[PDB]
Structures are given as structure tokens and as C-alpha cells.
Amino acid sequence: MYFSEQNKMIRKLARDFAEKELTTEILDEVEESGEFPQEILDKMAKFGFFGIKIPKSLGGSGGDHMSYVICMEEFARVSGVASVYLSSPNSLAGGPLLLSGTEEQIEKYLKPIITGKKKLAFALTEPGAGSDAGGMSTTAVDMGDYYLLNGRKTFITMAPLCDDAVIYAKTDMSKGTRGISAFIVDLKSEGVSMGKNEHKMGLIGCATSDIIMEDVKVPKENRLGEVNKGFSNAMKTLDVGRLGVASQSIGVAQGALDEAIKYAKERKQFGKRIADFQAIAFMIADMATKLEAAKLLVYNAASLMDNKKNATKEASMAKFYASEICNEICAKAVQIHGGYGYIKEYKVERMYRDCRVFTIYEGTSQVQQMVISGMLLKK
């Protein structure tokens, strides 16, 4: 779009930072040992990356949405898993707190995760309920002084590392999408148990498991906002989260393209250099124009959020198009690298694997199309 001069500065910061602290030596050790170095997380919160869009009014940083996408992009370019550790407190953890949470709840819960002392998991998906989150089966019962819950959540990012977790349970089983409340549960409590860490294809460095709840009692003082609003709470958090996912889509894209034209300048075949064969140079072009076209898609969505108009469609388009053409790009970059791009030492293969979930999680591309078409045809 047009970047406000402070946001250009922030771009400079996140660039030099992500480039300097995420070295090849480290990231390889992260893939081998699926553990991100706590020292780096602390280092990030110390300069505020854990608090980008939360304002100074609550002890945040006072940036705009465009600053969250900028840091998301410039980080994700260099490493995917870093982005995962970045979006959680900015969007997925700090979201529902920011909407339906009293000042006390925010005092005891949000400032820890902005400063990197506590970790919060956003836990919504169940084995029976994926795209159809409305068909949940986790229950929440009112006992007066506390709530009693019994259910099971799959695919919960960061959960074994998290101290508290926002869990969506069904209170009024008849009302369905209208009868879901949101609660904050301390994971160290009773009944709470974790499943195995799931062996995923990429984005290795952040654990992801099940949250199992067996007659876990939760106090009333830890409920999100009004009762049965929770679903709209989770949706309206999911919109900015989807902006996040498109942001990392656009990030890893820029990276894999940069490796693309770099390798294509340096490698020579048949006497010419790679980049002087018309097929390649055109291919580079194609990837570049799409990437830009859609960078513009997503920048625009975030700017809308910053000027307060509803961005629910625009973000959905951004996530959809961004993630899909990200995958196309990542693959083509493998193909330019040729054989060498299939060995793990060449960064392009780690990207190619990372960017694959991008079209599934945070709402699939299908859910995106359902939202978008459903938004355009109502008359």
C-alpha cells in the first residue's frame, strides 16, 4: 500500500532481527530436536515482538495491524516455526482476552504472555469437530461456584508448553452455535491431561497435541465474557488470526522466491546461467507478479482492520489466495533448484514442507470459499 514511516522502521527491525538471530546452525537443531530455544522467545518479548498490536494503554506496544503483518512476514520469510511462536500471543491468545475479558482477567493473564512469562493455547478443534466447530462435543456444566467439563481437543498448538488455555465448550447443548461459552483453564490443574505430540510434516519446532479434560472443574471467574457469546468471540478472533496465516503465507513465499532468483543467478547449465533460459526467467516473473498481486490483497485487508471497517471477507480472500499461491511458489522454487532442492541442506525444501498446512489450518481453503461465496450471494 503506502507504509507509515514508523511501520517502515518496524520492518527494518524485524528484518535485521529475524535474519541475525535465526541462523542456519540453530534452525537445523530445531528441526532435529523439536524444541524452540526459550532464550530466543525471551529475547523477542524483550523487544516487544510478543506485543505488537496490543497497545501501550494496557502495556502493549502501540503498533497497527499492518505492523503485525509486517513482523509476521519478515519473520516467516526466514523461519516458519518462528512465526508460529509469534502469532500466538499477538492474535490467537491475546485476541479473546482483548474482546470478552474483564480488566482483572487481562491483568492476571495477558501481561504475562506479552512479557513472555506465560504461554496460552487457543484450543477449539475436536476430533469430531473441525470445519464444523459448531458441532462440538465438549460439555460445560454450571454448578454455581464452578463449571464442570468433559471432552477432548485435537491439534492444539503449543499446548504442552502452555500454562493456561482458552477452551470452548458447549454450555447449552440445544442452542448449538448459539450456546457455546469460552473458559480459561489452567493446564496444571486436575483432570487435565495431554496427548502425544503429533509428528507433523513441517513446522517442527512447536509441540502440538491433544488437551484431554476429565471432570475438570473450572471456576466461574475464568469465563470469557457473557455466557453463550463465546462462538462469536472465537470467530472474531479467527478473522485476525487468518490475517496472520496469510501473513506467513506471504512471508515464506518471499523467502522461497529469494532463494529462487539467487540460485537461478548463480547456477550455470549448458554454458548459460540458469536465469538466462527463457523458461526460468518467465517462471520467476510469474511467481513474482502473483506474489505481489496478493501481497496487495493482504496488506489491504490489514489496513481495513486498522481503519475499523469489517474485514471478514477481505481477510478470508487474503488467507485463501495467499496460502494457495504460496504453495505453488514454494514448489516451483524447488523445481528451479533442480535436484539439489530435494536435499535438506538447501533451505527451499524446509519451506516447501512448512507452507503446506497453510491451506488447511485456521479454516481450510474450502471454509474460505464457503464464507466468501456465502457472503456474496444473499440478496
Binding site: P127, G128, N150, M173, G195, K196, I212
Partner: protein, 198 residues
């Protein structure tokens, strides 16, 4: 006599009859009928036959008879399965189901929740990631009922469920369902089991 039996692996019943054949004979399956009344001590007319053996008029000659106790049995080969999930709480629950499986003559299976908890090994797991089973009976004991499990036993000839919460999906394919804690329901099932004679 109208003789009926199952053929084609049990998919086509047929009433085969012998019109030009006297006598009419038929091997009959064990368990289909039931016992008659015992000790009216009506009568008897014990009749004699000859037993007139020959000088090698029986070429089959027996060296040894063996009675084995077959304890190894694969979850894929079994005819009766007692499967247990996270509704056991403790790893020791399988003893109960082991008691159940023994009166029937089959093995114990597991769901992923227990394997990833450490209560069993992956050889036992059933579902899309596990292994598919088509027993003659399946016991769905304390399993939520994710499709990740229901996928690998949908064609069990009859599925019996034992769960605490009635809002468990498993009751969608349960041929017979019982709501409760299995640690109480399971032993009572074995009680009435032997009480009729297996």
C-alpha cells in the same frame, strides 16, 4: 426334512433337501438348539451291534493326542474382540477385559488414547492408523467413538457398547448399548455368562 444352513461365508442361506435319499443326514452346528429335559429316566431298549473287526480293516492309527492352550492370538485373526479405551483410567483395566475375552476366546484391542498414554502397544490399536477388524463380536468399552476408531470396525457383525455418558457417538453403530461405568457392568456380564453354560 427341510435342511437349512448358511453358505457363501454366511451371505446366502439355503434350504437343501434330499428327495431320493434314505436316510437323510446332516451335521448340525453346536449351539443352535438347546438342551432337552434331563432325568425322566424314561426307559431304554439297549440294542446290540457286532463290532466285528478285521485283520487290518482300519488303516488310520493314532500315535499321540495333544491338548494345547493357545494363548497367542492376533487381533486380526480373532473371532471375538474386547476393546478398551481411555475409559479405564488405569492400565490394569485390560485384566477385566482379559477376563471377558477369555470366556469368549478372543483378544483385547486398544484405541490410540491408551497407546499414546502408555497403557498398551501399537499392535493392538484399531482405526485408520491402527488395524482393521471384522470379528463376530466387538466390545466398545469406554471409547469416545471418534471416526478414527469407528472406521476400523464398522463391519463387525455385532457391536456392543459400554460407556458412561450416553452422548457418546459409539451408540450410533452400537447394536446393543448399555450406559454406565464398565468396571461395574463388565463383571456382571461375565456372571450371567457361565450361568447358562457358554
Amino acid at each position: 426334512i427341510r435342511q437349512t444352513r448358511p453358505a457363501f461365508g454366511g451371505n446366502l442361506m439355503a434350504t437343501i433337501v434330499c428327495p431320493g435319499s434314505r436316510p437323510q443326514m446332516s451335521t448340525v452346528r453346536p449351539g443352535v438348539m438347546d438342551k432337552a429335559a434331563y432325568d425322566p429316566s424314561q426307559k431304554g431298549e439297549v440294542i446290540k451291534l457286532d463290532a466285528t473287526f478285521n485283520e487290518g480293516d482300519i488303516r488310520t492309527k493314532v500315535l499321540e493326542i495333544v491338548k494345547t492352550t493357545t494363548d497367542n492370538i492376533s487381533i486380526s485373526d480373532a473371532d471375538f474382540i474386547v476393546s478398551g479405551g481411555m475409559g479405564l483410567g488405569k492400565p490394569e483395566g485390560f485384566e477385566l477385559l482379559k477376563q471377558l475375552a477369555d470366556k469368549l476366546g478372543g483378544t483385547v484391542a486398544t484405541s490410540r488414547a491408551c497407546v499414546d498414554a502408555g497403557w498398551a502397544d501399537h499392535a493392538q490399536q484399531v482405526g485408520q492408523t491402527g488395524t482393521t477388524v471384522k470379528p463376530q463380536i466387538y466390545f466398545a468399552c469406554g471409547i469416545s467413538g471418534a471416526i478414527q476408531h469407528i472406521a476400523g470396525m464398522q463391519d463387525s457383525d455385532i457391536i456392543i457398547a459400554i460407556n458412561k455418558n450416553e452422548n457418546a457417538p459409539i451408540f450410533e453403530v452400537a447394536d446393543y448399548g448399555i450406559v454406565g461405568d464398565l468396571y461395574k457392568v463388565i463383571p456382571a456380564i461375565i456372571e450371567e455368562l457361565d450361568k447358562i453354560g457358554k
